[PDB]
Design an enzyme around this catalytic site. Structure first.
Site, PDB file in Angstrom:
ATOM      1  N   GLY A  24      10.337   9.614 -26.044  1.00 52.03           N
ATOM      2  CA  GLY A  24       9.403  10.031 -25.603  1.00 52.03           C
ATOM      3  C   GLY A  24      10.292  10.202 -24.122  1.00 52.03           C
ATOM      4  O   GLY A  24      10.804   9.426 -24.013  1.00 52.03           O
ATOM      5  N   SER A  25       9.034  10.427 -23.118  1.00 57.21           N
ATOM      6  CA  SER A  25      10.160  11.285 -21.500  1.00 57.21           C
ATOM      7  C   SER A  25       8.200  11.212 -21.303  1.00 57.21           C
ATOM      8  O   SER A  25       8.081  12.490 -21.741  1.00 57.21           O
ATOM      9  CB  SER A  25      10.918  11.883 -21.307  1.00 57.21           C
ATOM     10  OG  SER A  25      11.967  10.509 -20.962  1.00 57.21           O
ATOM     11  N   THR A  27       8.855   7.141 -20.481  1.00 58.98           N
ATOM     12  CA  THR A  27      10.013   6.587 -21.517  1.00 58.98           C
ATOM     13  C   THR A  27       9.842   5.865 -22.808  1.00 58.98           C
ATOM     14  O   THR A  27       9.470   4.214 -22.324  1.00 58.98           O
ATOM     15  CB  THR A  27      10.973   6.312 -20.649  1.00 58.98           C
ATOM     16  OG1 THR A  27      11.479   7.014 -19.788  1.00 58.98           O
ATOM     17  CG2 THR A  27      12.184   6.620 -21.624  1.00 58.98           C
ATOM     18  N   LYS A  47       7.700   0.341 -24.164  1.00 61.87           N
ATOM     19  CA  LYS A  47       7.467   1.631 -22.700  1.00 61.87           C
ATOM     20  C   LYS A  47       7.535   1.159 -22.057  1.00 61.87           C
ATOM     21  O   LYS A  47       6.699   0.078 -21.302  1.00 61.87           O
ATOM     22  CB  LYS A  47       5.726   2.117 -23.573  1.00 61.87           C
ATOM     23  CG  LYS A  47       5.308   3.281 -22.395  1.00 61.87           C
ATOM     24  CD  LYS A  47       3.904   3.091 -22.547  1.00 61.87           C
ATOM     25  CE  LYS A  47       3.059   3.935 -21.734  1.00 61.87           C
ATOM     26  NZ  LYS A  47       1.789   3.815 -21.803  1.00 61.87           N
ATOM     27  N   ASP A 135      -9.382   8.238 -22.145  1.00 63.39           N
ATOM     28  CA  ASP A 135      -8.641   9.432 -22.689  1.00 63.39           C
ATOM     29  C   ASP A 135      -8.152   9.820 -23.875  1.00 63.39           C
ATOM     30  O   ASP A 135      -7.401  10.309 -24.566  1.00 63.39           O
ATOM     31  CB  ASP A 135      -7.435   9.250 -21.621  1.00 63.39           C
ATOM     32  CG  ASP A 135      -6.354  10.125 -21.689  1.00 63.39           C
ATOM     33  OD1 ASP A 135      -7.065  11.682 -21.757  1.00 63.39           O
ATOM     34  OD2 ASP A 135      -4.986  10.259 -21.246  1.00 63.39           O
TER      35      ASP A 135
HETATM   36  C1  LIG Z   1       5.538   8.752 -27.487  1.00 63.17           C
HETATM   37  C2  LIG Z   1       4.937   8.318 -28.730  1.00 63.17           C
HETATM   38  C3  LIG Z   1       3.991  10.139 -29.504  1.00 63.17           C
HETATM   39  N1  LIG Z   1       5.262   8.700 -29.594  1.00 63.17           N
HETATM   40  C4  LIG Z   1       5.277   7.117 -30.939  1.00 63.17           C
HETATM   41  C5  LIG Z   1       4.410   5.799 -30.701  1.00 63.17           C
HETATM   42  C6  LIG Z   1       4.746   4.629 -30.780  1.00 63.17           C
HETATM   43  N2  LIG Z   1       4.132   3.535 -30.905  1.00 63.17           N
HETATM   44  C7  LIG Z   1       2.929   3.084 -30.004  1.00 63.17           C
HETATM   45  C8  LIG Z   1       2.713   2.491 -30.083  1.00 63.17           C
HETATM   46  C9  LIG Z   1       1.484   1.954 -29.515  1.00 63.17           C
HETATM   47  N3  LIG Z   1       1.197   2.466 -28.096  1.00 63.17           N
HETATM   48  C10 LIG Z   1       1.740   3.895 -28.724  1.00 63.17           C
HETATM   49  C11 LIG Z   1       1.534   3.967 -27.068  1.00 63.17           C
HETATM   50  C12 LIG Z   1       1.111   3.887 -25.808  1.00 63.17           C
HETATM   51  N4  LIG Z   1       1.489   4.582 -24.622  1.00 63.17           N
HETATM   52  N5  LIG Z   1       2.134   6.088 -25.250  1.00 63.17           N
HETATM   53  S1  LIG Z   1       2.069   7.398 -24.409  1.00 63.17           S
HETATM   54  O1  LIG Z   1       3.414   7.660 -24.956  1.00 63.17           O
HETATM   55  O2  LIG Z   1       0.764   7.333 -23.597  1.00 63.17           O
HETATM   56  C13 LIG Z   1       0.979   8.723 -25.764  1.00 63.17           C
HETATM   57  C14 LIG Z   1       1.033   9.060 -26.780  1.00 63.17           C
HETATM   58  C15 LIG Z   1       1.198  10.363 -25.480  1.00 63.17           C
HETATM   59  C16 LIG Z   1       2.041   5.475 -26.270  1.00 63.17           C
HETATM   60  N6  LIG Z   1       3.028   3.665 -29.212  1.00 63.17           N
HETATM   61  N7  LIG Z   1       5.907   4.595 -31.759  1.00 63.17           N
HETATM   62  C17 LIG Z   1       6.688   5.825 -32.441  1.00 63.17           C
HETATM   63  C18 LIG Z   1       6.606   7.178 -31.697  1.00 63.17           C
HETATM   64  C19 LIG Z   1       6.878   8.702 -31.833  1.00 63.17           C
HETATM   65  C20 LIG Z   1       7.905   8.663 -32.628  1.00 63.17           C
HETATM   66  O3  LIG Z   1       8.357   8.520 -33.576  1.00 63.17           O
HETATM   67  C21 LIG Z   1       9.078   8.138 -34.237  1.00 63.17           C
HETATM   68  C22 LIG Z   1      10.143   7.626 -35.271  1.00 63.17           C
HETATM   69  F1  LIG Z   1      10.727   6.737 -34.105  1.00 63.17           F
HETATM   70  F2  LIG Z   1       9.421   6.739 -35.765  1.00 63.17           F
HETATM   71  F3  LIG Z   1      11.353   8.136 -35.938  1.00 63.17           F
HETATM   72  C23 LIG Z   1       8.600  10.371 -32.614  1.00 63.17           C
HETATM   73  C24 LIG Z   1       8.194  11.529 -31.437  1.00 63.17           C
HETATM   74  N8  LIG Z   1       8.489  12.092 -31.596  1.00 63.17           N
HETATM   75  C25 LIG Z   1       9.099  12.701 -32.365  1.00 63.17           C
HETATM   76  C26 LIG Z   1       9.613  14.207 -31.650  1.00 63.17           C
HETATM   77  N9  LIG Z   1       9.415  14.637 -30.783  1.00 63.17           N
HETATM   78  C27 LIG Z   1      10.894  15.418 -29.906  1.00 63.17           C
HETATM   79  C28 LIG Z   1       9.096  13.781 -29.556  1.00 63.17           C
HETATM   80  C29 LIG Z   1       7.753  13.125 -29.962  1.00 63.17           C
HETATM   81  C30 LIG Z   1       6.668  10.664 -30.447  1.00 63.17           C
HETATM   82  C31 LIG Z   1       6.662   9.469 -30.218  1.00 63.17           C
END
Ligand SMILES: CC(C)n1c2cc(Nc3ccnc(-c4cnn(S(=O)(=O)C5CC5)c4)n3)ncc2c2c(OCC(F)(F)F)cc(N3CCN(C)CC3)cc21
Length: 301
Positions: A24-25, A27, A47, A135
């Protein structure tokens, strides 16, 4: 005053983990964490630069390191290199908002109501810890497995001081469409204002990812809600489920449900899910070198 916060803040060596891809981003990276000489590999999200920027990421690390509940994301550790990196548990299925959008046609009522229960458990835990999230939104709930979600993003989270149970904020970019009315007007936040956000979050799930008040500029929202308008009843929702949501949106914050009651009500509905959500095709749907891999939930102190 209050009880001492003896959470441990783990400082991780840059050599102990490998970034693998960008998730993501706006990032976050996917990656692997191999604690020095432990024969474990832990899937992680990393992150990642002003002096106020690191001031805030460290406040989040403070909150994330201080929680420990099956339905909240915990900080595994931080890395203090050229830039500050949070090391978190990999949530392989992304945010629940994206998940309900990408999988509308195979999400049944049992998943929807169980997610509601789990999020209420997470929030009830945060309330136990005198934390106000500020939030709560479906974008801030992540999917470890389709049957196990966790609340994340503590970038606005506020621990309530020893005595007063209310937070007064400053200005900034705030998430208007998820906020209690008393927060939009007087920048007041309580656990009961989190209940309002819970109601909006539930509404996001029951509409499979719709945007709340879609099209309406946020400056209009405070007056809409003052007139008595609320989000509409989603087509899959019986009145039993919609009445729970609407109770989260009462003007009197003390008249909204408590998280511990939301656990109970949605638990009851989860034992007979087709009585409370009406989804076309419900009883048909179904949702799902690495020899030393261990999930973070099984890697303890
Ligand atoms: C950034 C977040 C939402 N996200 C993950 C976060 C974590 N873990 C954690 C664990 C604890 N806290 C956070 C955290 C802190 N802050 N925030 S946050 O961003 O502010 C808020 C959410 C808006 C997130 N992230 N683990 C895997 C993914 C993950 C992912 O995993 C896929 C795989 F790698 F497993 F295969 C795929 C995708 N996407 C699929 C593809 N599309 C194009 C984009 C989104 C997003 C993913």
């Amino acid at each position: 005053g209050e009880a001492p916060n003896q959470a441990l803040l783990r400082i991780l060596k840059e050599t102990e983990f490998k970034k693998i891809k960008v998730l993501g981003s706006g990032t976050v990276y996917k990656g692997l964490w191999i604690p020095e000489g432990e024969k474990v590999k832990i899937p992680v999200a990393i992150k990642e630069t002003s002096p106020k920027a690191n001031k805030e990421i460290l406040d989040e690390a403070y909150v994330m390191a201080s929680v420990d509940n099956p339905h909240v994301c915990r900080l595994l550790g931080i890395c203090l290199t050229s830039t500050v990196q949070l090391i978190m548990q990999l949530m392989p299925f992304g945010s629940l908002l994206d998940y309900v959008r990408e999988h509308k046609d195979n999400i049944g009522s049992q998943y929807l109501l169980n997610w509601c229960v789990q999020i209420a458990k997470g929030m009830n835990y945060l309330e136990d810890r005198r934390l106000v999230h500020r939030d709560l939104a479906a974008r801030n709930v992540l999917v470890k497995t389709p049957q196990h979600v966790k609340i994340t993003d503590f970038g606005r989270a506020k621990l309530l001081g020893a005595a007063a149970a209310e937070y007064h904020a400053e200005g900034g970019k705030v998430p208007i469409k998820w906020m209690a009315l008393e927060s939009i007007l007087h920048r007041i936040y309580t656990h009961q204002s989190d209940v309002w956000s819970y109601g909006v979050t539930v509404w996001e799930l029951m509409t499979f990812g719709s945007k709340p008040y879609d099209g309406i500029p946020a400056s209009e929202i405070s007056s809409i809600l003052e007139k008595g308008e609320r989000l509409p009843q989603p087509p899959i929702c019986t009145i039993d489920v919609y009445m729970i949501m609407v109770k989260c949106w009462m003007i009197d914050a003390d008249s909204r449900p408590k998280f511990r009651e939301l656990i109970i009500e949605f638990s009851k509905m989860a034992r007979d899910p087709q009585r409370y959500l009406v989804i076309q095709g419900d009883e048909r749907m179904h949702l799902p070198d690495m020899d030393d891999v261990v999930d973070a939930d099984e890697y303890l102190i």
